[PDB]
Amino acid sequence: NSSSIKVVKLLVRLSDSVGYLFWDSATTGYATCFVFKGLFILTCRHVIDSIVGDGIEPSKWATIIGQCVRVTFGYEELKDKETNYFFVEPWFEIHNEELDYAVLKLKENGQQVPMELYNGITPVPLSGLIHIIGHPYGEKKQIDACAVIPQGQRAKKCQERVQSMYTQRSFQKIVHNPDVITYDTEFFFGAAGSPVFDSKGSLVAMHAAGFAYTYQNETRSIIEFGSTMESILLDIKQRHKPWYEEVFVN
Amino acid sequence: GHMGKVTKNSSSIKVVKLLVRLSDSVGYLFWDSATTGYATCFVFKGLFILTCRHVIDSIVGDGIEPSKWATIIGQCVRVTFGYEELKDKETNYFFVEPWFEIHNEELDYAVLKLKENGQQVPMELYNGITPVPLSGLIHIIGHPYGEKKQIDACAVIPQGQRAKKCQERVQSKKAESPEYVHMYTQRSFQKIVHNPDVITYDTEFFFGAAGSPVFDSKGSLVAMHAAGFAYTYQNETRSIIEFGSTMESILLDIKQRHKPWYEEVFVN
């Protein structure tokens, strides 16, 4: 579970591109995001669901996002929670519900936009150590070193953890899913959109959600998963090819 | 790990940035004497660095006259602060002055002095006296197994549980098979069971990390990692519990036994 000083020195520099996204309009909430490419940031899709609310026509979604969403990258202490924030352009076009990702665009306000975290496609580790950087529980920015659950063991672990709410009939969407990476982390609450890097510090996935339960007045989670950057970028290449060529190759 | 009773392993970005700043003051100490070996040290105060006493025992050797120890140290010990990759293992190193006067066997600490050879002396890690945490999370920075510099976030074992937890692991692994064995004396384990001068924790730096600085959850130097209680099972070597001498005890011992040097170094 220990890491080398070199990798952690890389990770703390990368953490400046991990942001806290918050909104306070008709709905109130938070999430984690990160600078994907250029002025574009990446987060989860159910985050946008929380931002807009139920029963709203899609034609209005962008207008809502550009009116109430703020993103700050310097949230390391309580005082910095809702200060020095970028606005978001009223634009919402690149997303997918299955892979659970959403692309937003920051609005330049004369500040320094953090370095992009997408350096290229990095293969997903089948085992070993990973590092998740985000804002769990809406708290200050934190980093966690986590153990990866190999896909072939996903069906086992779950059934153990239930026998040691839900059923094994409910994990059917992640047990044999090669587009997600499973792991045991403490960032299982409100850390949607937190980047997940491999043991060398390369962006490999984005944390999605978990499965919460209560035990001795404390909220725990059975298993956590995230959408792999390979899957997200391939879906973007296929569904939004003009935007992909406009942003990524030039 | 969220299946049993677990302490939070994660840290905040602010504390981790502080710790990567402090790691530049953690040094890999290697020696080529009658025996060849390695350990960890850290810049204590000014040019002085702190490591473990049994490290000096391993450097000098058995039976050597004490009057020679210093002269051996300042001739064979080298310390590098940039061992973050394999290529930097024994590059850009300081020598140590032929000086060995401040040490203690019971608390297992030893003070050495770097020799300014043109290299950059790191920042000292001793700012003030920090109370020892009774529980929670700590961070160890060092060179375990002689590898590149690493940092581990570990769970503190409260003092009152030292007698409990340990046995719970012993009887857990010992009941299985008759090939289990401890590699430590019980007389050596009973010296930390009710000892407030050491802090105990569960870490992965139970090898070659002697002298590694141990910081609290906020990033303040609180202890120096000493040793562990190793046990082998199925030909794999684990450790029941690890411990470190608190900086409180070390500084008190320095004030009591070496008052002139303490006033010469710390107050003036």
Numbering used by the authors:
A (entry chain A): 340 to 503, 514 to 599
B (entry chain D): 332 to 599
Question: What does the study report here?
Answer:
FAM111A (FAM111 trypsin-like peptidase A) is a serine protease involved in multiple cellular processes including antiviral defense and DNA replication. FAM111A contains a serine protease domain (SPD) with a conserved catalytic triad (His385, Asp439, and Ser541). The FAM111A SPD belongs to the S1 family of serine peptidases, which includes chymotrypsin, in the MEROPS database. Here, we show that FAM111A is a dimerization-dependent protease containing a narrow, recessed active site that cleaves substrates with a chymotrypsin-like specificity.
To mitigate the potential problem with protein production due to autocleavage, we generated the mutant SPD (S541A), which lacks the serine nucleophile of the catalytic triad, and performed crystallization trials with the purified protein. Overall, the individual SPD chains are similar to each other, with root mean square derivations (RMSDs) ranging from 0.15 Å to 0.3 Å over Cα atoms. Thus, we focused our analysis on chain D, which is the most complete, but our analysis is broadly applicable to all chains. Interestingly, a protrusion of β-strands (β2 and β10) buttressed by helices α2 and α5 yields a protease domain with an active site located at the bottom of a trench, whereas the active site of chymotrypsin is shallow and accessible for substrate engagement. FAM111A possesses an oxyanion hole formed by the backbone amide nitrogen of Ser541 and Gly539, as well as a P1 residue binding pocket (designated as the S1 pocket) similar to that of chymotrypsin. While the S1 pocket in FAM111A is about 0.5 Å narrower than that observed in chymotrypsin, it can still easily accommodate phenylalanine by allowing rotation of the peptide bond between Phe537 and Phe538. The loop L4, which is disordered in the monomeric SPD, is structured in the dimeric SPD and forms salt bridges with Lys348 and Lys345 of the dimerization partner through Glu415 and Glu416. Furthermore, the loop L4 contains Tyr414, which is positioned in the dimer structure adjacent to the loop L6 that is also unstructured in the monomeric SPD but structured in the dimeric SPD.
